Each structure stands twice: as structure tokens, then as C-alpha cells.
């Protein structure tokens, strides 16, 4: 049936861009730290390069109406069209806003879209408007609908501009249709219960090992390789991996046994991968091509060959739980089962 | 009426003319000087 966006769901703002006469899907992103301005990340070639949904994602915080908005700035709710919504960047913690600066290329009345810390002010508030005649003003918003976002302070729209050589996001009086896809919902079944897009440590033995990379001496090729280490690396940041689901929508769902995913070293920024001649190795974002960076968790090492399951659109059952559940890391393509060389810190 | 007219005009920026439209449109002063030159010079002001 039809689910509705709520005041705590984790969503991504997506737009459709057709350049070189080929339609592409692009997601709004913002680093936040060191760069307030927003940009676009192309998620079309997810099989060729990974999208960084970690910064591409946002969370809805408020859905209060405009009357209460201006009222209380003068002093799990459901999204309804025309409400003033607050979008908070999940990573940076700032809120999407319409910056007063005008970097736009000879657009004059257009502004720039960025991130702001303070919630006060109408700049951070956006109003949802129906894309077409299927929806109605005041009706609740549904999953998969297209939206038009209007800034309160500037009364402009989140506009995809092709004017520059690259594609930009600017608050202009031209409107572009944004499709909202959900990542995670407010249910968030219990604790543990490994969830897509999580930062974790992979411990081998009795809480006495961690899969990390050589980082004490620095060096690019030294960081490149992967090994097992014991000690304070269990506390340092060099033993942190993000588990990225291969799909965009519902990427914050519970990870199930046999589900393919990618492992990204958080500090190094490169994706772990297999090359049969030289075992495991990290490699750049550009080279991650699914076949080499696709791994999975197995409950039993026996070759059950469970195959592919139907991709349910939701939280799903919580199969793998943190700590208690034991997992076997298996390469999706080759079917190899990790293991250690047992070389005799 | 003033608010409605301003809102409609800013929704449709082409109403301001070649100048004041942006994206390669010169300033109001430049447009007025160009129009003065056009009025002074025949074959651009009349039909001819």
C-alpha cells in the first residue's frame, strides 16, 4: 500500500537530469565541514562508481504549518503539502538553507543553496508543493511523489541549473521537480541489528582483533593493503568501515544474510575489494565496479547458495545483530571466504 | 494590486525587456543609451 513521509524519516532529494540526451539521477549533497555549498552526486552509474549517500542524505525534523511558523518565529507528524518542512543534514548536522550570497552565473535574482547551523530564520524552512494534479494542497505527502520546494525567506525554488558547464543547485524562480526517496524510517527495530550505511569494526577473534590497514607509518601503498591487527587499533579510527548497500532507496534498511554490500574504509575513503592474484586490496572510488567490491555476510560457511531474495521496500527483518551474531564475509562474485594467512601488533 | 503585479512580473521576468532580464541582458543605463543612439541614427529608428 501507500506509505507517507513523516517528521523523522531519513530521505534523499533526487532530481532527473537529461544531458547528452541521456537521463541521469542526481542526489543533492553537502559536505558541510569546510564547504557550506551544496552540489549533486550522480547515482545513475552505481555499478561503476559508488554514490556517497552519507552526505547525500537528509532527515525531516518539523512539518509545522506556515501560520504557526511565522507565529512562533514572531514569539511523528505526517508531511502535508504546503507545510513548512525542516531538512537537517544527517552527517554535518546543519540544515538546508537558501544562502543570501549570489554566486549564480548571471542569474541576478537567484541565490545559492547551502547549509546553516541556526534553525531560527525563515531561510532554513521550505514549503512542499505538489508536482502535478494527482496531489492536492493540504493533502498528506506520499512516498515516491515528486515535490516542489519553495524557500520561505526568498520565495524561490530548488532549481537545477544547466547554465554553467557543470550542473548546479540554486534557489531560482524556475522550478525543478525533486523526487524524494526514503532511506530509513522511525521504527528502527531495537538496538544492534546491523543497518545499511553503518560504521562498524569487524572483529575476528574473541574481541581481540580488527580488520584494518597499515597506518602507523603513513604511505599510500602502505594504507592500500588490508590486514588484521590487535590492540589500540580497536579504538583508533583506522579500523572503521562503512557498510554501504548496493541500492539507493531504503539503503538504511536492516541488512539481511546474503545481501550484497560494499565496505569503505572511513579514514582512507577507499573501498575494500578482491583481486584474486593479490588477495584483498583497497582501491579508489572511481574503480569500484560492484563485481570486485561486492561482499556479503553469511550465517553458515556451508555453500547453501541461497541466491537472490526479493528486495523488500522497507525496514525488513533484523537478521544480523551486533556482537552476538557471528558472520562470515564472502565475496559475492568469487565466493571466497576471507580467512587469515596466519603469518608467524 | 501592487503585490500581485510584482509577484507576477518576477514570476515572468521577460516582461522587463531584453535588458533587466539577465543571462546576457545589459543594464538599464546601457539600454537607455543604446535606445538614444538608435533614435538618433536613422535606418534603425524608422522603417526605411
Swiss-Prot record, chain A:
Tissue and organ distribution: Detected in heart muscle (at protein level). Heart muscle, brain (cerebellum and hippocampus) and placenta.
Modification note: Channel activity is modulated by phosphorylation. Phosphorylation is increased in failing heart, leading to calcium leaks and increased cytoplasmic Ca(2+) levels.
Domain of life: Eukaryota
Domain MIR stretches: 76-131, 138-183, 191-246, 252-309
Compartmental location: Sarcoplasmic reticulum membrane
Up-regulation conditions: By TGFB1.
SUBUNIT field: Homotetramer. Can also form heterotetramers with RYR1 and RYR3. Interacts with FKBP1A and FKBP1B; these interactions may stabilize the channel in its closed state and prevent Ca(2+) leaks. Interacts with CALM and S100A1; these interactions regulate channel activity. Identified in a complex composed of RYR2, FKBP1B, PKA catalytic subunit, PRKAR2A, AKAP6, and the protein phosphatases PP2A and PP1. Interacts directly with FKBP1B, PKA, PP1 and PP2A. Interacts with SELENON. In cardiac muscles, identified in a complex, composed of FSD2, CMYA5 and RYR2.
Function description: Cytosolic calcium-activated calcium channel that mediates the release of Ca(2+) from the sarcoplasmic reticulum into the cytosol and thereby plays a key role in triggering cardiac muscle contraction. Aberrant channel activation can lead to cardiac arrhythmia. In cardiac myocytes, calcium release is triggered by increased Ca(2+) cytosolic levels due to activation of the L-type calcium channel CACNA1C. The calcium channel activity is modulated by formation of heterotetramers with RYR3. Required for cellular calcium ion homeostasis. Required for embryonic heart development.
Free-text domain note: The calcium release channel activity resides in the C-terminal region while the remaining part of the protein resides in the cytoplasm.
Family: Belongs to the ryanodine receptor (TC 1.A.3.1) family. RYR2 subfamily.
Disease implication from the record: Ventricular tachycardia, catecholaminergic polymorphic, 1, with or without atrial dysfunction and/or dilated cardiomyopathy: An arrhythmogenic disorder characterized by stress-induced, bidirectional ventricular tachycardia that may degenerate into cardiac arrest and cause sudden death. Patients present with recurrent syncope, seizures, or sudden death after physical activity or emotional stress. CPVT1 inheritance is autosomal dominant.
Protein's name according to its UniProt entry: Ryanodine receptor 2
Organism: Homo sapiens (Human)
Amino acid at each position: 500500500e501507500i506509505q507517507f513521509l513523516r517528521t523523522d524519516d531519513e530521505v534523499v532529494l533526487q532530481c532527473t537530469a537529461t544531458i547528452h540526451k541521456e537521463q541521469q539521477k542526481l542526489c543533492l549533497a553537502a559536505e558541510g565541514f569546510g564547504n557550506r555549498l551544496c552540489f549533486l552526486e550522480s547515482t545513475s552509474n552505481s555499478k561503476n562508481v559508488p554514490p556517497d549517500l552519507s552526505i547525500c542524505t537528509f532527515v525531516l525534523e518539523q512539518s509545522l504549518s506556515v501560520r504557526a511558523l511565522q507565529e512562533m518565529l514572531a514569539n511523528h507528524r505526517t508531511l502535508l503539502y504546503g507545510h513548512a518542512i525542516l531538512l537537517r543534514h544527517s552527517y554535518s548536522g546543519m540544515y538546508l538553507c537558501c544562502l543570501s550570497t549570489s554566486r549564480s552565473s548571471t542569474d541576478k535574482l537567484a541565490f545559492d543553496v547551502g547549509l546553516q547551523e541556526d534553525t531560527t530564520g525563515e531561510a532554513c524552512w521550505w514549503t512542499i508543493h505538489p508536482a502535478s494534479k494527482q496531489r492536492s494542497e493540504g493533502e498528506k505527502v506520499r512516498v515516491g511523489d515528486d515535490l516542489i520546494l519553495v524557500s520561505v525567506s526568498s520565495e524561490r525554488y530548488l532549481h537545477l541549473s544547466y547554465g554553467n558547464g557543470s550542473l548546479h543547485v540554486d534557489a531560482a524562480f524556475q522550478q525543478t521537480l525533486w523526487s524524494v526517496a526514503p532511506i530509513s524510517s522511525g521504527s528502527e527495530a531495537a538496538q544492534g541489528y546491523l543497518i545499511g550505511g553503518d560504521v562498524l569494526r569487524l572483529l575476528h577473534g574473541h574481541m581481540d582483533e580488527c580488520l584494518t590497514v597499515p597506518s602507523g607509518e603513513h604511505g599510500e601503498e602502505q594504507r592500500r593493503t588490508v590486514h588484521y591487527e590487535g590492540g589500540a587499533v580497536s579504538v583508533h579510527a583506522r579500523s572503521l568501515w562503512r557498510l554501504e548497500t548496493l541500492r539507493v532507496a531504503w539503503s538504511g534498511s536492516h541488512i539481511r544474510w546474503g545481501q550484497p554490500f560494499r565496505l569503505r574504509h572511513v579514514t582512507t575513503g577507499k573501498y575494500l575489494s578482491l583481486m584474486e592474484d593479490k588477495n584483498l586490496l583497497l582501491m579508489d572510488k572511481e574503480k569500484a565496479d560492484v563485481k570486485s567490491t561486492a561482499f556479503t555476510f553469511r550465517s553458515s560457511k556451508e555453500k547453501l547458495d541461497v541466491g537472490v531474495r526479493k528486495e523488500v521496500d522497507g525496514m525488513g527483518t533484523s537478521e544480523i545483530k551486533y556482537g552476538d551474531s557471528v558472520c562470515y564475509i564472502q565475496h559475492v562474485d568469487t565466493g571466497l571466504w576471507l580467512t587469515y594467512q596466519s603469518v608467524d601488533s | 494590486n501592487a503585490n500581485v503585479v510584482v509577484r507576477l512580473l518576477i514570476r515572468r521576468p521577460e516582461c522587463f525587456g531584453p535588458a533587466l532580464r539577465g543571462e546576457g541582458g545589459n543594464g538599464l543605463l546601457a539600454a537607455m543609451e543604446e535606445a538614444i543612439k538608435i533614435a538618433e541614427d536613422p535606418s534603425r529608428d524608422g522603417p526605411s
